[PDB]
Design a protein around this ligand. Structure first.
Ligand SMILES: Nc1ncnc2c1ncn2[C@@H]1O[C@H](COP(=O)(O)OP(=O)(O)O)[C@@H](O)[C@H]1O
Ligand SMILES: Nc1ncnc2c1ncn2[C@@H]1O[C@H](COP(=O)(O)OP(=O)(O)O)[C@@H](O)[C@H]1O
Ligand SMILES: [Mg+2]
Lengths: 14, 278, 370, 269, 188
């Protein structure tokens, strides 16, 4: 789920 | 961007190649993509004309029940077609595939004896052999030479069963006292799409010769040639299907390897090919 | 003719014969010709050099066996003629070929020349009054009191799935494969060789066939029993010695569901059945899946029904009812159907006259058949 | 425009399969808004490319593509040199080359020629891959055709490391043409898609590639059998229904006899 | 089996051997004076030559018809009542049981091996039998290398020299943990 986590990580930071 | 002329050209390209018994939803799809009926219709008239021309579609005449075939040979040009059974000129709406205004048209009738004898014998034959078997016979003067054209067509559509099929056999036959020539083209188009897709397109060309002594005798000989040609063609198709898995299909993928045993994947992975020595 | 007709089901392995209207064939014997291979030295040895029927079984070790039919196709026609005259011999069905019409049963999708030569033999060498050739599966469905359903007839030479709807077998939906009980017996012979038991003799092939019949089964899961070490079950040979069979008990019949275990480019029996069902229009498919009738000897394997059910369920569409019917009279079901068909007075209109055969020939017998 | 997407998909499924590429390109010019989406759904015959470093034929797909470049499976380099690219991995690259060798052997055994290409990529607690096979019919014999097969497999590795779950989806595009004396010309196109799931014990004796290859060959054999038997015998039946070799008078007589037989059977039950 | 048949025929010629040590003398007689006639029926009807063989003790024996009828057992097992295929039948049935595509190249590539293939005239006789059984317009090439006795050992030596042989053997630990299954998967 690393690709999924990174997309969420961009959203969480912004 | 795309020019509208190119748009309707692609629309005609898709329309003319539609499989038999599915032109209506192909048309529905092409308008739904274009979203322009008025823009489409001018070239769509030519596209539908050609599709219904080369496909030999049968259209019923309500007042006659002749059920004549639409063919390039029996075309007049006022969006009208001449049924040689009873000599009836009728307008044909390609959009609805409907016959209107049955109008007698005066032909000289020089070839009517040959045309009618061939039509009678050919109807007897088509009813004997085909399932539905809609047929017509025309007379023409090609390059000044008198010719009789037999057209046979048999269609079976079951979109409920996910399959359509069409047989169409055209046979030109020139009149010549010493020896006459017969030239035939047979086309079969079958589509079947239940949880998959398969499209058979078969074509055959035949050439033979006959002798012209009596019109009834010549017509009987012609129908015997039709019998022999179509019987041998259909039996050849059946045999070709029988030898599909053995030889024809084997050129692409074999049912089993040449070793006649399933691949031992552990063997090939762990050990090399084993052809290091030579 | 007002005399009683005789039904003959000439299978590859066993040939059933009997007067029509009987509930059972009383004259079934193996379909091979035995010839003595040892040299006769005394005055008073067994007379004759051809041994067919129970005599061939009594003196089995004395004879070399030859099978005239292979995969439902008559390879040796002289031996077939000898067997068909033995059917009329005084040992079994003491009668004359001239007195009784014959209902011959034949495998489906056979070559044209086979039917032609069978008709020629029955009309010329035998002066038979009336012959009718039929199929093996449609009769097997007639036996079980049905007219719609799919028959999976698995005999000794050939196994075929035939869907019949309202009596008339669909000629286009017939499925046939040549791996059958004989191939399973050969595979069992090879595996027994791999246990340290050689049965290369022709008479020992019948002992291998008996071992197949009496001690074999089909495992529910192939790999599960393949990996598990099976208990060694001991079988008693005719001489009195014993052999430990072991894994060859279940590896042998697995040929039926995996033809690639002997390098045959063909489909399995479950695939054959499911393809026969799916080759028909869908409205009848749901009825065909319910009405599945097993037939032939090879369907009698211990656990055949369960494995076939599992495989057909694995292949068939989900949410479709599947029911396998296994009649107790599976061996004689085809003959029972032949007897039922011959009992009908309409059979009087279904046979071919000697005058009709002389006039037309194979055209008459092939237009009379389906 | 989901309705127009379904329209385009149905139309493309309806058109002949040999002209799939040209007609798809033409249709792209009509409604370009869904074109890439169409290219994601519509299945197309594969393209061959020359890996010059090793000198091999490799198949171009959408999974190895990166922008306007295609990654070779042997060289592990894009045919257009990309300064930045997505290599699969270190371990998955060894899995990829092992799969390439294994499927080269499988292709040689089953097809005797053609080209093959296995491309792997990682996945959520697992890895996915695509196995592409192409095989154009040789011109030595009158039979001329093409076989394309795309098998996308998804491997979910269980936490224990011994068990795994495989989900295989296979598409086969077949085309055959024969020009014989009797048949004159026969042209059998077709396409067929199937799917199946399984779970297998990963081990040194039974690694991942063995399981994927076993599933792929089982699916290929099943698809070949179905195409040869059901989807071609149905066309045979249709051609036999369009015209009858036997006359209809004889058929009517046989059917009357059959009606007599079935009524007689129905009476005795 | 050929040497046992030769012992039986020598018994039928008056020269009787019982002992297990004298079976080795019979084996030596087979290896020394025995040949395969190209035409068995032609040589059968003709008068024999009766070549003399010197036994280890110094006595002599006249062989005659047993010289060529003993290796005949390879091509005709029915001479001892076995209903099994002959050696030529073994070869041809192995070729014809294979794929139809491979039959031509299998006929074009036949390799003899083992000690019993060293009989005088073995190659010509087998070629004649295979040609009798094989289809026409198929080239037949039976290869008879000089190292027939040690061909299989030389093959084992070639295989064991490769580095791939490391990946082929059943290790000791593998047998310890699995047992017969390790050899069962690794051999096949
Ligand atoms: N209980 C059984 N288990 C397994 N096989 C059997 C059994 N009984 C009979 N057979 C096999 O079935 C075959 C006979 O089946 P049958 O229906 O008579 O075939 P055919 O129709 O060709 O005569 C024999 O070869 C025999 O080996
Ligand atoms: N020159 C020869 N002529 C005939 N037979 C021979 C000859 N040399 C050896 N043999 C036979 O070949 C056998 C040995 O063959 P070999 O290849 O060693 O068998 P194996 O494969 O069991 O080792 C012996 O029994 C011997 O009788
Ligand atoms: Mg039977």
């Amino acid at each position: 789920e690393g690709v999924l986590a990174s997309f969420f990580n961009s959203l969480l930071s912004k | 961007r795309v020019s509208d002329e190119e748009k309707v050209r692609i629309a005609a390209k898709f329309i003319t190649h539609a499989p038999p018994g599915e032109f209506n939803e192909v048309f529905n799809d092409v308008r739904l993509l274009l979203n322009n009926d008025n823009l489409l219709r001018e070239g769509a008239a030519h596209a539908f004309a050609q599709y219904n021309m080369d496909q030999f579609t049968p259209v019923k005449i309500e007042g006659y029940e002749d059920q004549v075939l639409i063919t390039e040979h029996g075309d007049l040009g006022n969006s009208r077609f001449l049924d040689p059974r009873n000599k009836i000129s009728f307008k044909f709406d390609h959009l609805r595939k409907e016959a209107s205004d049955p109008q007698p048209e005066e032909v000289d009738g020089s070839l009517k004896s040959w045309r009618e004898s061939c039509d009678s014998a050919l109807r007897a034959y088509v009813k004997d052999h085909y399932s539905n078997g809609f047929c017509t016979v025309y007379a023409k003067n090609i390059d000044g030479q008198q010719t009789i054209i037999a057209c046979i067509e048999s269609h079976q559509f079951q979109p409920k069963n996910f399959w359509n099929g069409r047989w169409r056999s055209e046979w030109k036959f020139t009149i010549t006292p010493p020896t006459a020539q017969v030239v035939g083209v047979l086309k079969i188009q079958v589509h079947y799409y239940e949880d998959g897709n398969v499209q058979l397109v078969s074509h055959k060309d035949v050439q033979d010769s006959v002798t012209v002594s009596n019109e009834a005798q010549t017509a009987k000989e012609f129908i015997k040639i039709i019998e022999h040609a179509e019987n041998e063609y259909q039996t050849a198709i059946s045999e070709n299907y029988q030898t599909m898995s053995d030889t024809t299909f084997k050129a692409l993928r074999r049912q089993l390897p040449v070793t006649r045993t399933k691949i031992d994947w552990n063997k090939i992975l762990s050990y090399k090919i084993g052809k290091e020595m030579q | 003719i007002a005399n009683q007709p005789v039904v003959i089901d000439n299978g590859s392995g066993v040939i059933k014969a009997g007067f029509a209207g009987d509930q059972i064939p009383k004259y079934c014997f193996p379909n091979y010709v035995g010839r003595p291979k040892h040299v006769r030295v005394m005055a008073g040895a067994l007379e004759g050099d051809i041994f067919i029927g129970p005599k061939a079984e009594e003196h089995r070790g004395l004879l070399s066996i030859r099978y005239p039919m292979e995969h439902g196709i008559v390879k040796d026609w002289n031996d077939m003629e000898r067997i068909w005259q033995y059917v009329y011999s005084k040992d079994q069905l003491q009668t004359f070929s001239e007195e009784h019409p014959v209902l011959l049963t034949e495998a489906p999708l056979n070559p044209r020349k086979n039917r032609e030569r069978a008709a020629e033999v029955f009309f010329e060498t035998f002066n038979v009054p009336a012959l009718f050739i039929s199929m093996q599966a449609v009769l097997s469905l007639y036996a079980t009191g049905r007219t719609t359903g799919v028959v999976l007839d698995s005999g000794d030479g050939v196994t075929h799935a035939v869907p019949i709807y309202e009596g008339f077998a669909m000629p286009h939906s017939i499925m046939r494969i040549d791996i059958a009980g004989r191939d399973v017996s050969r595979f069992l012979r090879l595996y027994l060789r791999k246990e340290g038991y050689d049965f290369h003799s022709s008479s020992e092939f019948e002992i291998v066939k008996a071992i197949k019949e009496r001690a074999c089964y089909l495992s529910i899961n192939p790999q599960k029993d393949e990996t598990l070490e099976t208990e060694k079950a001991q079988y008693y040979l005719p001489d009195g010695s014993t052999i430990e069979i072991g894994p060859s008990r279940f590896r042998a019949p697995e040929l039926l569901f995996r033809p690639d275990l002997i390098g045959e480019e063909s489909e399995g029996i479950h695939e054959v059945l499911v393809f026969a069902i799916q080759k028909s229009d869908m409205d009848l498919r749901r009825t065909l899946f319910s009405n599945i009738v097993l037939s032939g000897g090879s369907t009698l394997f211990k656990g055949f029904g369960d494995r076939l059910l599992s495989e057909v369920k694995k292949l068939a569409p989900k949410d479709v009812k599947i029911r396998i019917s296994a009649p107790q009279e599976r061996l004689y079901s085809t003959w029972i159907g032949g007897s039922i068909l011959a009992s009908l007075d309409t059979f009087k209109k279904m046979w071919v006259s000697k005058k009709e055969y002389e006039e037309d020939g194979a055209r008459s017998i092939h237009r009379k058949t389906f | 425009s989901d309705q127009q997407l379904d329209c385009a998909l149905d139309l493309m499924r309806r058109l002949p399969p040999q002209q799939i590429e040209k007609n798809l390109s033409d249709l792209i010019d009509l409604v370009p808004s869904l074109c890439e989406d169409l290219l994601s759904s519509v299945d197309q015959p594969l393209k061959i490319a020359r890996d010059k470093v090793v000198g091999k034929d490799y198949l171009l797909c959408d999974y190895n593509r990166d922008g306007d470049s295609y990654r070779s499976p042997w060289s592990n380099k894009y045919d257009p040199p990309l300064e930045d690219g997505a290599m699969p991995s270190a371990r998955l690259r060894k899995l990829e080359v092992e799969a390439n060798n294994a499927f080269d052997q499988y292709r040689d055994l089953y097809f005797e020629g053609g080209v093959s290409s296995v491309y792997l990529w990682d996945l959520d607690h697992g890895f996915a891959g695509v196995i592409l096979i192409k095989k154009a019919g040789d011109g030595s014999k009158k039979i001329k055709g093409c076989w394309d097969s795309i098998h996308v497999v998804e491997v979910q590795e269980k936490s224990s490391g011994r068990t795994a779950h495989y989900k295989l989806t296979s598409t086969v595009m077949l085309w055959l043409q024969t020009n014989k004396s009797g048949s004159g010309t026969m042209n059998l196109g077709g396409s067929l898609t199937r799917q199946m799931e399984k779970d297998e014990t990963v081990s040194d004796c039974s690694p991942h590639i063995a399981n994927i290859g076993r599933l792929v060959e089982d699916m290929e054999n099943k698809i070949r059998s179905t195409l040869n038997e059901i989807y071609f015998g149905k066309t045979k039946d249709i051609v036999n229904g369009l015209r009858s070799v036997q006359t209809f008078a004889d058929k009517s007589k046989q059917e009357a006899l059959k009606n007599d037989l079935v009524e007689a059977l129905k009476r005795k039950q």
